[PDB]
Swiss-Prot record:
This is Endothiapepsin. It comes from the Eukaryota. The chain holds residues 90 to 419 of 419 of the full protein. Disulfide bonds join 255-290. Residues 17-328 form the Peptidase A1 domain. It catalyses: Hydrolysis of proteins with specificity similar to that of pepsin A, prefers hydrophobic residues at P1 and P1', but does not cleave 14-Ala-|-Leu-15 in the B chain of insulin or Z-Glu-Tyr. Clots milk. Keywords: Aspartyl protease, Disulfide bond, Hydrolase, Protease, Signal, Zymogen. It comes from Cryphonectria parasitica. Belongs to the peptidase A1 family. The keyword Metal-binding does not apply. One of its GO terms (molecular function) is aspartic-type endopeptidase activity.
Amino acid sequence: STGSATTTPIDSLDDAYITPVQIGTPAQTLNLDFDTGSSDLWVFSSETTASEVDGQTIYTPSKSTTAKLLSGATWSISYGDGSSSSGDVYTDTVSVGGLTVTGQAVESAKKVSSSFTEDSTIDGLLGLAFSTLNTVSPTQQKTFFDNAKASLDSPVFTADLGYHAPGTYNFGFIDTTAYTGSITYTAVSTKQGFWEWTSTGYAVGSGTFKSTSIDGIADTGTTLLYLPATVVSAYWAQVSGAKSSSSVGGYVFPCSATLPSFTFGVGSARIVIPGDYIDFGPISTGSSSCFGGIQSSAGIGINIFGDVALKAAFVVFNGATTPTLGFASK
């Protein structure tokens, strides 16, 4: 089997992307944030504290003939950005772009933090990291991909995120029309539960590529590109007027500036992020100061190839017995 679904930015800055997911019988369609950096599929629901719901579409398990309560099970997650959610657990039929998994754990939120409430466009998350990170207790549950894997024509999914435009998540096949040139594959470590890999280096604008190992994670659920302070400083030094602002929380630059591209290495291959992808707009409405899309990972504890990086590529998440990641230009 295969599946293919369109993913759409939630706003004009590509802060996140939402993909429609069918849950239950009859289907309830919710727009979920596919997150290769976590491993829980959780939704706003009829059980979510009413005061914490503000415009989201909710899952109502009592209206699904296929919903089953996982007796006594709970879940609770905290994300890198400080947000969180928790609740109880159902299994139900879940379909993405024509691909159906029966008995998928659908984690129903009883509580969500303010950042989720405040985002009316995101009805939940669909985790696509390794199932070892799943937070269900007492018994961990498998991700949608892990459950679908054996049935897929090939044990892969691909992310093809758009810049200020829709893109595509495919399951079970590689669309050879969706990229230019060849896909370069690189090794993955699953030791921390992430799609963790080692970039071979970077370049700033037209500068000569610097060969240096950068361990990090491919994370569709993170907006920006978070890299070591050395790398990030080298980038912003090439932008007139750019500076790191503790007040704002990162590198800012004059909105009128021309941003250089940023290149990262995948083996001997190279992915070029156009300068415009690194512009995240005015720091506040009406400001002439803009927020940068490449920021330091110092104090995160891990480098993160988030949407800023991934949307410059066609990305293969190869869930074979020994997982790998593939990147192509597009």
